[PDB]
Enzyme design. Structure first.
Site, PDB file in Angstrom:
ATOM      1  N   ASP B 290       0.828  -1.200   0.000  1.00  0.00           N
ATOM      2  CA  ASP B 290       0.000   0.000   0.000  1.00  0.00           C
ATOM      3  C   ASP B 290       0.865   1.254   0.000  1.00  0.00           C
ATOM      4  OD1 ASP B 290      -3.021  -0.811   0.255  1.00  0.00           O
ATOM      5  OD2 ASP B 290      -1.936  -2.179   1.567  1.00  0.00           O
ATOM      6  N   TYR B 294       0.788   2.162  -3.879  1.00  0.00           N
ATOM      7  CA  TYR B 294      -0.346   3.071  -3.975  1.00  0.00           C
ATOM      8  C   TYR B 294      -0.095   4.442  -3.363  1.00  0.00           C
ATOM      9  CZ  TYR B 294      -3.022  -1.263  -4.850  1.00  0.00           C
ATOM     10  OH  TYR B 294      -3.486  -2.484  -5.303  1.00  0.00           O
ATOM     11  N   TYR B 374     -10.021  -1.445   2.402  1.00  0.00           N
ATOM     12  CA  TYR B 374      -9.269  -1.368   3.635  1.00  0.00           C
ATOM     13  C   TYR B 374      -9.147   0.030   4.170  1.00  0.00           C
TER      14      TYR B 374
END
Ligand SMILES: [Cu+2]
Ligand SMILES: [Cu+2]
Ligand code: NA
Ligand code: NA
Lengths: 620, 620
Positions: B290, B294, B374
């Site tokens: 993540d 991202y 999430y």
């Protein structure tokens, strides 16, 4: 009219009257333990029978007695004479503590030990410590305390800063005789004070802290009925108090829609052991079972609003018996309140555009106890999502010694000449389980690593396995943090909507257990502390992991003796005993008064509910 | 004029102007990462040079660039063309997410997969997930996302309740081409909704919760100067924010009398990995970083008073760049406040008659991020006694699949027909250590059990041992909960008054690390996650445990490559990388939105101070 209500001053006076009238409480007798008994299994018998268990000491040397009385019928039910040389001594009496110093102050061996150190006897405090069981034949059947000396320079001085090393005495507290004085040599007494209220040590106090105000303008969300019955956010339980175990939780249950679902029948810290790791003959015997030997409930502090307990606090004031059967109130001995616990659940969804946040909360039930230099806080937490947590907070002043010249492998130095021996603080939680009722079983759950191959060609797969514990002889388990080992307590006869047995998962901290050699005295007496998890079949007399009479018992009682019965525990009324502890290598920052350190465990639902049980929490 | 101040909207506009004027930011270019650079070692050079690092994507397929600019001098310092097939792709762009669904909606293989399931394409949402590196030769050098489908019955519906199993697609997001559609067979789409705001699922909302009011009538005890410099209760630090790492702490230091003592130079979560343990070809590639892929900072939520952050809250609003170089403000992106933390220290002494109690407090610095299903909370805590703690809170909606008929070893069932694949959430803390300055070393401390014998005749003794980590080749360490293993970071050249090196002790939770087969793709790419502790020698370019460009990199970059240099770390400028994670076997209680679970670590002083640093706390 709850059978689980707290003992009242009247009931204890009644117990005193019944024992007096029965000839069991004359002037030479002392109550060493008194506590209400839990109802037997299946309380369908209408009208409660409030029964009290009493340990009666005889200060003239006659044999003590275990007595059971019924205050509902005003009768003695049973009175057993005890052979203490076989089954162990009674718990230490408060009036026996003050006796070790007074005798030693007129013993000539003690006086010459102090003279050789140029110490004034009026200034020497003696810490009276439980004796244990070692190689001193003359101690069997006698009631013995051991004493270590500290110098107090003035009445307000912290004696712990001035240990007198190389000196220890053994005292028979019934016959008032000093059995031995051992002087292995003089050590310098450390001279720095440890007075944490002295401005010359603290410096000017900070002025930078602004108040935090925690209020509940509409009062708290929990209700108390019947003196000690709590309802809060679907939870229901009763808060008991025992002079030996301290706070006890009964009938923990959760309102799942229109049905009260039991989770835990009784929860307590059933034993505590503090073993010391210093091989010096001056301290190598030093172990105590604060619960079993001293009774931690009777040393509970009165907790002060805004200092010990901050917020909208509800207090319980438990009643215990003194050594003559008179009731004594521990005012503000138990604090309960709820506190904010951050975010409970949160999701911002891009596809639906819904943003969702809810806060968490926990119910807190706590007390504090002080034994000598140590202060221990016991905290039970109930959370909105079904989680139950226990936390022990350890603080006080560290037990000190001289720091040897040339160093030590078992003591750390806190100040010039001042040492603190290595030790552990180890707890035993007794969880009388009742997941959806009494037919329960325990499984050990391990993470399972999978190898790269067919049916896992990318080598990403992993899984888990559960091993059912079917008999007590296989129910002594060790932790394994590397494989994520946990234990699930489930009810094979009660299934969730997915047709899986309902369950709760026990999450341990996986701290080291008892470090002493497996052949040592303390390993025999504190056998429970050598393993992380035990499961027994329920039995009314199996209450403590070390046995009923821990003071000066030779070992092997309690859990290893229960376990050998090899009883069926697969879908049965079972009890879980979890050992957990702090291993304390004292730091300079622990001196002159230590900041809190913590340890504990928790239980989380595992397929107990048919979905999240906090969908109905509002936003505020 | 602090070199550690937050980037301002003006600086980002200036970076945009400099890049435009230099010919580097035309209409086909996109900023995939922009962030300020930390000052180099030894900031004695007067006047700061504010330098920004930029990753520039080219939407026409031309090679991306790494660019460094100086906004103080308005110049491009360096511009490097990147070979992504060798050193990895740039982080995923936000505008590339929305593209996976749109292409697939007109691909005939996708349309016939949906037709065979009687699914209407207007209702199928596609979760766009990072691709990883496997055995698809045509993907090397291309920018690829993979898509999994969920049915949304209406715009407000939670799509996660309706996974479309057996179906996955691969999309080239630069050329806008669907490379593969894989249909391993039809699975029933689970039909129960998972809408946690629907009254028909929640029931009536509880009315039993009364408000908890936490106020600070005189304001908070911390001050903020220079936008982002915090002073609180002897602590000093700067709160930075990076679009990739999120909140970054700089210059953590503690005022010990008349001297500012450094502890940690820079603290961050430098990487995150979420590997899935389902061997199904539909999901066996599913891993994401993540942070690295991202950028978790750019998905930070605006935190709402009284919901996400309760109390007297001070907010920071960080500024980041959008994909064209325009500044964007994350309003209320960072919450800071102090909160009560129970008892700090307590002792009731019988010999002195002094009763002592002090309260504890902690400074909280937090943000929340949302990626897909999430939601992750990052919490840094500073305590009065010198303790520093990090806590990750994991929540959101679980990633779902069909639950197979006949069961699964790698998926748990949450609802009829609805599964949740097993997975981990694993974090990497990068702690650029500076205990009393920069000459530091790390020791591994193990509890040592002793055998009963001479010099330990009662078998009670135990001790500990410390092993110094002298070179990087020996600095890759594993946890050992059974021996109480911890790591101490000390300064061999800075001693406390007892002439012992000052230190801090790292306490891990000892949760399982990466479970995938050591030969798998994810083990190569997330190599840091296979061990609990790494120590490297500091270097300005060694910032992330997985390397600079994690998206679609083949592995081995980062920590294993740093470590092979085998540099001296005994009394040197060192960096500690701690892996810690949650292994998530989803429960029924995690559905339809999960309650928070947590993991983290902490550091406690170990002979850093000459006594307790909280003697000067007042009573209130
Ligand atoms: Cu301790
Ligand atoms: Cu998860
Ligand atoms: Na039971
Ligand atoms: Na460093």
């Amino acid at each position: 009219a709850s059978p689980f209500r707290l003992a009242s001053a009247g009931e204890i006076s009644e117990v005193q009257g019944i024992l007096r009238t029965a000839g069991l409480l004359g002037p030479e007798k002392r109550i060493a333990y008194l506590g209400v008994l839990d109802p037997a299994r299946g309380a369908g018998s209408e009208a409660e029978d409030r029964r009290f268990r009493v340990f009666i000491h005889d200060v003239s040397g006659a044999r003590p007695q275990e007595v059971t009385v019924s205050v509902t019928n005003g009768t003695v039910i049973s009175a057993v004479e005890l052979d203490t040389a076989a089954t162990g001594e009674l718990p230490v009496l408060e009036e026996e503590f003050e006796v070790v110093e007074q005798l030693l102050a007129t013993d000539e061996r003690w006086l010459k030990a102090l003279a050789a150190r140029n110490l004034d006897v009026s200034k020497v405090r003696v810490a009276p410590l439980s004796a244990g069981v070692f190689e001193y034949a003359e101690e069997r059947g006698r009631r013995i305390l051991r004493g270590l000396a500290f110098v107090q320079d003035f009445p307000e001085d912290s004696a712990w800063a001035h240990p007198v090393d190389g000196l220890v005495a053994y005292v028979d507290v019934v016959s008032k005789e000093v059995t031995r004085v051992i002087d292995t040599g003089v050590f310098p007494v450390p001279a720095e004070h440890g007075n944490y209220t002295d401005p010359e040590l603290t410096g000017p106090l900070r002025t930078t802290q602004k108040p935090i105000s925690i209020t509940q303008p509409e009062g708290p969300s929990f209700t108390v009925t019947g003196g000690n019955h709590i309802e809060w956010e679907k939870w229901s339980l009763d808060v008991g108090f025992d002079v030996r175990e301290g706070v006890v939780l009964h009938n923990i249950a959760f309102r799942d829609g229109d049905r009260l679902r039991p989770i835990i029948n009784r929860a307590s810290i059933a034993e505590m052991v503090v073993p010391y790791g210093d091989p010096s003959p001056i301290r190598s015997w030093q172990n105590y079972f604060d619960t079993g030997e001293y009774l931690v409930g009777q040393y509970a502090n009165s907790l002060e609003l805004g200092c010990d307990c901050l917020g909208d606090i509800t207090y319980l004031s438990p009643v215990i018996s003194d050594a003559f059967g008179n009731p004594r109130e521990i005012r503000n001995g138990i604090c309960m309140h709820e506190e904010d616990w951050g975010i409970l659940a949160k999701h911002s969804d891009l596809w639906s555009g819904i943003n969702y946040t809810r806060r968490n909360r926990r119910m807190v039930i706590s007390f504090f106890t002080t034994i000598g230099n140590y202060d221990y806080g016991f905290y039970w937490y109930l959370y909105l999502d079904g989680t139950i947590e226990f936390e022990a907070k350890a603080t006080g002043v560290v037990f000190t010694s001289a720091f040897p010249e040339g160093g030590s492998d078992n003591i750390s130095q806190l100040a010039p000449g001042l040492g603190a021996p290595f030790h552990q603080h180890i707890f035993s939680a007794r969880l009388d389980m009742a997941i959806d009722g009494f037919t329960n079983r325990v499984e050990e759950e391990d993470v399972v690593r999978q190898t790269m191959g067919p049916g896992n060609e990318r080598g990403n797969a992993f899984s888990r396995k559960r091993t059912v514990l079917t008999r007590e002889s296989e129910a002594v388990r060790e932790a394994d943090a590397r494989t994520g080992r946990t234990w699930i307590i489930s009810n094979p006869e009660s299934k969730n909507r997915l047709n899986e047995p309902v369950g709760y998962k026990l999450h341990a901290h996986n701290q080291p257990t008892l470090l002493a050699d497996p052949g040592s005295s303390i390993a025999r007496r504190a056998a429970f502390a050598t393993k992380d998890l035990w499961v027994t079949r329920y039995a009314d007399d199996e209450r403590y992991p070390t046995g009923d009479f821990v003071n000066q018992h030779s070992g092997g009682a309690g859990l290893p003796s229960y376990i050998a019965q090899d009883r069926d525990i697969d879908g049965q009324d079972i009890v879980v005993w979890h050992t957990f502890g702090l291993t304390h290598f004292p730091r300079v920052e622990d001196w002159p008064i230590m900041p809190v350190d913590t340890v504990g465990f928790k239980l989380r639902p595992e397929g107990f509910f048919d979905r999240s049980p906090v969908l109905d929490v509002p936003a505020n």
